[PDB]
Write a protein that binds this ligand. Structure first.
Ligand SMILES: CC(=N)N1CCC(Oc2ccc([C@H](Cc3ccc4ccc(C(=N)N)cc4c3)C(=O)O)cc2)CC1
Ligand SMILES: [Ca+2]
Length: 223
């Protein structure tokens, strides 16, 4: 997260860290047994880490649970990142408490202008590399589709939305992928892609979660 602020230990209880010997992507806990992340984060041998603050220090509030199965969206296109969403089932149910909580799915999509909270352990530099060990947060509004499509001609589908600032300076970045974009207390987006990080006229692109609620519910109930 570039231009954000330190969230504070366990202030984003639904945030998860996907680990394969190291942190590689973020995710969101939707219930005690399921995690939603980005399809481009797919890997074999994923361990889900909950209750995390500093990813390099064990503070006693963590729960490390291996994934039993991963389900990438059936229409995921790796070339365009259309339908960049995947579901991960935990081998054992997570114990929900103050520091480990689930985030609710939307009843409707969020309108442009709505302020959201984006979080992650990704790169904090727009130019250069500096990975934080503590969770970073960023408040950002959902941008109009026009501004989004103008920034990325012919690359934005109805399953994506832009959020952030056209002037640059604040944005999600590499390492934040698969992470949560929560607006009005509901999971509205998943960190997907963009052009660089925090660059002028290049806002972040996120998977529009409100389009997948039916698929999510049917899939988790059948697996
Ligand atoms: C042809 C087409 N339709 N495209 C091209 C691919 C594009 O997807 C991608 C997929 C991956 C990449 C990465 C770089 C990357 C990865 C994750 C990111 C996550 C967030 C942000 C951001 N600035 N908000 C930027 C990122 C940038 C890389 O360098 O490999 C960049 C664009 C979708 C749009
Ligand atoms: Ca830790």
């Amino acid at each position: 997260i570039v231009g954000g602020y330190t969230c504070g230990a366990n202030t984003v209880p639904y945030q998860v860290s996907l680990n394969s010997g190291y942190h590689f992507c973020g995710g969101s806990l939707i219930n005690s047994q399921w995690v939603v992340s980005a399809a481009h984060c797919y890997k074999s041998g994923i361990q889900v880490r909950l209750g995390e603050d500093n990813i390099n220090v064990v503070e006693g509030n963590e729960q490390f649970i291996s994934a039993s199965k991963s389900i990438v969206h059936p229409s995921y296109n790796s070339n365009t990142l259309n339908n960049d969403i995947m579901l991960i089932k935990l081998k054992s149910a997570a114990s929900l408490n103050s520091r480990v909580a689930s985030i609710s799915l939307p009843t409707s999509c969020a309108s442009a202008g709505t302020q959201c909270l984006i979080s992650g352990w990704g790169n904090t530099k727009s130019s250069g590399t500096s990975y934080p060990d503590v969770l970073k947060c960023l408040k950002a509004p959902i941008l109009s589709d026009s501004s989004c499509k103008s920034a990325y001609p012919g690359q934005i589908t109805s399953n994506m939305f832009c959020a952030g600032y056209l002037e640059g300076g604040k944005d999600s970045c590499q390492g934040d992928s698969g992470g949560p974009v929560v607006c009005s207390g509901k999971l509205q987006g998943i960190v997907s892609w963009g052009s660089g990080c925090a660059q002028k006229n290049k806002p972040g692109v996120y998977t529009k979660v409100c389009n997948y609620v039916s698929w999510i519910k049917q899939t988790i109930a059948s697996n």
